[PDB]
């Protein structure tokens, strides 16, 4: 699948907990962990639209109160080919 | 797909109607019908997360007004391997 | 994907807008545009169950206030194999 | 891996949700899914005491609202040698 699901959190502890819930919840793949700076850490998951909706909801519910908290939880069913240039392909 | 949808009903007639409605609604393969006992019958399907959401909604509606009715409708976007041992593989 | 999402409109302008919004919103392939007659235009897409849900809602919302308006917005997660004989496979 | 954690639910759907949440939370092996009769389903898991406490918390929270509901969530850090003669060791 190609549907993109993003969860942004204040700190890394919320991000890792969110990523654990997302991957555990549905058939999504962790494709990147971005340090936006200023204590914003984003985790991006790609999968089918049904899977990503479940994965993102699990991540938001799991990290909502972990650490500093949750900033944003978004789902994009189809990203424009232009945006792919700025999305990580695999995490490091 | 590996998402799991389950519908629990009081009696077998609602369960058969649920299983029929779920399979016809979306791409969900029927995997088992377990007699829990005490009047409970459960029908389990497997499929993609998006398909299971549509199938379970249809099955819940189909068996709501049949006999004693519906008890539980649940979707699991991903099921751990250890739980596979307690899930029917093919209906018998 | 099997899931079928059809949007029917009065006149072509809403159909093109509905077709545009549907495809952009989610990962659905446009399979046919049909002139039913009497001003009806039907736009059909095929994709995943989750993708089709996202697309059809996007298409239905977009074309409501465009032109004569929207007639219907229908989703079929799985169509009986027989119905696939009368469905278009690529727009012409 | 000795500590025993049991969750009892009314129906099989809440039991399967409890088993999934219990197993996802921590390293606990699912030992049995017992149909008690009268609608009771009991899922027993075994593992280290720390993991079991985490597993049972996840199961009690996950299956509380699913279906008829949760009946009992119980942990025994060490069972008497006599009791193990009445505990399942492999789920059937």
């Amino acid at each position: 699948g190609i549907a993109l699901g993003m969860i942004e959190t204040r700190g890394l502890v919320p991000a890792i907990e969110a990523a654990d819930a997302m991957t555990k919840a549905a058939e999504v793949r962790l494709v990147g962990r971005q340090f936006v700076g200023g204590g914003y850490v984003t985790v991006l998951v790609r999968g089918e639209t049904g899977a990503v909706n479940a994965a993102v909801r699990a991540g938001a519910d799991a990290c909502e109160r972990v650490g500093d908290g949750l900033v944003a939880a978004h789902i994009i069913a189809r990203v424009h080919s232009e945006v792919e240039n700025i999305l990580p392909k695999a995490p490091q | 797909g590996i998402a799991l949808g389950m519908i629990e009903t009081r009696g077998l007639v609602p369960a058969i109607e649920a299983a029929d409605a779920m399979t016809k609604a979306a791409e969900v393969r029927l995997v088992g019908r377990q007699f829990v006992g005490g009047g409970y019958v459960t029908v389990l399907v497997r499929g993609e997360t998006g398909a299971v959401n549509a199938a379970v909604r249809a099955g819940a509606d189909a068996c709501e007004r049949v006999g004693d009715g519906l008890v539980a409708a649940h979707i699991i976007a991903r099921v751990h391997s250890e739980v596979e041992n307690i899930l029917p593989k093919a209906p018998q | 994907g099997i899931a079928l999402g059809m949007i029917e409109t009065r006149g072509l302008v809403p159909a093109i807008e509905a077709a545009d919004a549907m495809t952009k919103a989610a990962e659905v392939r446009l399979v046919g545009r049909q002139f039913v007659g009497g001003g009806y235009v039907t736009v059909l897409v095929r994709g995943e169950t989750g993708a089709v849900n996202a697309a059809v809602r996007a298409g239905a919302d977009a074309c409501e206030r465009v032109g004569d308006g929207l007639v219907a917005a229908h989703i079929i997660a799985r169509v009986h194999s027989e119905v696939e004989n009368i469905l278009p496979k690529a727009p012409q | 891996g000795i500590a025993l954690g049991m969750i009892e639910t009314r129906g099989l759907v809440p039991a399967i949700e409890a088993a999934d949440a219990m197993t996802k939370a921590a390293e606990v092996r699912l030992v049995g899914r017992q149909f008690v009769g009268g609608g009771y389903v009991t899922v027993l898991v075994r593992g280290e005491t720390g993991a079991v406490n985490a597993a049972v918390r996840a199961g009690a929270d996950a299956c509380e609202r699913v279906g008829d509901g949760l009946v009992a969530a119980h942990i025994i850090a060490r069972v008497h040698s006599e009791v193990e003669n009445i505990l399942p060791k492999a789920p059937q």
Binding site: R57 | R57, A60, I76 | - | -
Partner: peptide
């Protein structure tokens, strides 16, 4: 009615044009 991951996060998600 139908429990699952679709019921977990309420009002915290964005960008979902889910039907109905």
């Amino acid at each position: 009615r139908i429990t699952g991951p679709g019921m977990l996060a309420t009002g915290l998600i964005t960008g979902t044009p889910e039907f109905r």
